[PDB]
């Protein structure tokens, strides 16, 4: 049974070999392929990539900040990772459809709590095919009426196992993708924990899968590296509500990665 | 270069072999797998499956009916495939967000024309990563505020080639999937024609990919059949607007399928 990380490495190689030159909205060049998918088991292991050191603390702290529904940058930097960030992902997760005012405003009971709704739906009908939440790039919101989402997460339950599929309309393969694999795998562990299920698979699906030109050389070196067995993720405490999770509740065990690779943002 | 239909057949086989028993909302049993993807080239061929005869006339007539924005069942049966169907896919495509009244009402300039917006976006910025349209199951609309979509189509342009990715949150592999491959591949040919591009790939991505229990025996027989080379699709007329297409503008050439397989709906 091959290491799950071989999928990521195969995809990078495929884009390098077969990808087409295409510019992003900033005009920076990429190599691009449309339509990709990879499946990472969450059963007794956690897919934090090992062919380079992934910044786990940032993954964990950022996700917890999303879950809080915060729109304050300072609330994130203080953890070690003015300040008003607008209706970012967290606000959309917990207060979907609410008119954003101030980051200091009170949004209690305003908008749709997509995150709690996913959890509530898992509890009331685990077979439901509508267990979905979506997020938008904030810049899209005033651009047009009813802009399309940037990403969606669909959840699925069978045999007491929770799976999650993340569809992103575009994915930065060098910098963004490894981080997001960890991030949504972590989210699935949290939701599984809350709903009394065990984690199953995390499936990552992309529209425009691209590599920035300045990431090509570092990525070619990363490809020469053999994956080490994935670590495990332990939740150290019995937790009842998703808002109750804290960074100290989580422990990554046996993470043995290759050295950090810097990719220019 | 293997026949594209081998993907569909491999997926069916995988679900039969590895799928888990799971009930649909009607309580009818299925075998289910979460997360699938397949890529069908549209370059000089058209993916109308050959291991069974697919009803091309129904695909073509239904799509044209969607494009019209019609909510009248009679307007479809009359082509050979009371009558008020509600805010079905066509209404959502052309009048997204508009309050549905009567199927005889006048919706001119009401709602967002998602379909024309996709076309307009392809023409104004083919690199845009937001070239997306979405559809909802009508039954979901009064269920909750802001229900998630049932399907989305993302388009992508590179080297003068148009590709389309259809993500459906669930897919009936026996009956629905072959029909939808033809349907969205056809939609991509139409949009490509309108925008002066050539068709590239159609990528079909599923959340809950399932086979109904009563389709298992027919599908096992279908698996014994070797695909014949895909047919071609010809557009017979230069057409300028998507609303101008008629069924007579299209010609399937060299379709040589195995016999019809009946699957109980």
From Swiss-Prot, chains A, B:
Main localization (coarse): nucleus
Transmembrane portions of the chain: none
Chain residues that bind (6R)-5,10-methylene-5,6,7,8-tetrahydrofolate: 172
Keywords: Cytoplasm, Disease variant, Dyskeratosis congenita, Isopeptide bond, Membrane, Methyltransferase, Mitochondrion, Mitochondrion inner membrane, Nucleotide biosynthesis, Nucleus, Phosphoprotein, Transferase, Ubl conjugation
Catalytic EC class: transferase
Binding-site list for dUMP: 25, 129-130, 149-150, 169-172, 180, 210-212
GO biological process, one term: methylation
Pathway participation: Pyrimidine metabolism; dTTP biosynthesis
NCBIfam families cross-referenced by the UniProt entry: PRK01827.1-3 (NF002497), thym_sym (TIGR03284)
Connected disease: Dyskeratosis congenita, digenic: A form of dyskeratosis congenita, a rare multisystem disorder caused by defective telomere maintenance. It is characterized by progressive bone marrow failure, and the clinical triad of reticulated skin hyperpigmentation, nail dystrophy, and mucosal leukoplakia. Common but variable features include premature graying, aplastic anemia, low platelets, osteoporosis, pulmonary fibrosis, and liver fibrosis among others. Early mortality is often associated with bone marrow failure, infections, fatal pulmonary complications, or malignancy.
Quaternary context: Homodimer.
Record's protein name: Thymidylate synthase
Annotated source species: Homo sapiens (Human)
């Amino acid at each position: 049974p091959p290491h799950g990380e071989l999928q990521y490495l195969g995809q990078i190689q495929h884009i390098l070999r077969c990808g087409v030159r295409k510019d992003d909205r900033t005009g920076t060049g990429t190599l691009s392929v449309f339509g990709m998918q990879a499946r990472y088991s969450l059963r007794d292991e956690f897919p934090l990539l090992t062919t380079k050191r992934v910044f786990w603390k940032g993954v964990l702290e950022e996700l917890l900040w999303f879950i809080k529904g915060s729109t304050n940058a300072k609330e994130l930097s203080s953890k070690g990772v003015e300040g008003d960030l607008g209706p970012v992902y967290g606000f959309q997760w917990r207060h979907f459809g609410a008119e954003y005012r101030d980051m200091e405003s009170d949004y209690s009971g305003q908008g749709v709590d997509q995150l709690q709704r996913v959890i509530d739906t898992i509890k009331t009908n685990p077979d439901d095919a509508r267990i979905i939440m979506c997020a938008w790039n904030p810049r899209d919101l005033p651009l047009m009426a009813l802009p399309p989402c940037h990403a969606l997460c669909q959840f699925y339950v069978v045999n007491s196992e929770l799976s999650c599929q993340l569809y992103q309309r575009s994915g930065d393969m060098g910098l963004g993708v490894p981080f997001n694999i960890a991030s949504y795998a972590l989210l699935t562990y949290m939701i599984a924990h809350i709903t009394g299920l065990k984690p199953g698979d995390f499936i990552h699906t992309l529209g425009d899968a691209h590599i920035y030109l300045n990431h090509i050389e570092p990525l070619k070196i990363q490809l020469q590296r053999e994956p080490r067995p994935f670590p495990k993720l332990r939740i150290l405490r019995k937790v009842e509500k998703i808002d109750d999770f804290k960074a100290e509740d989580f422990q990554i065990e046996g993470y043995n990665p290759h050295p950090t690779i810097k990719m220019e943002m």
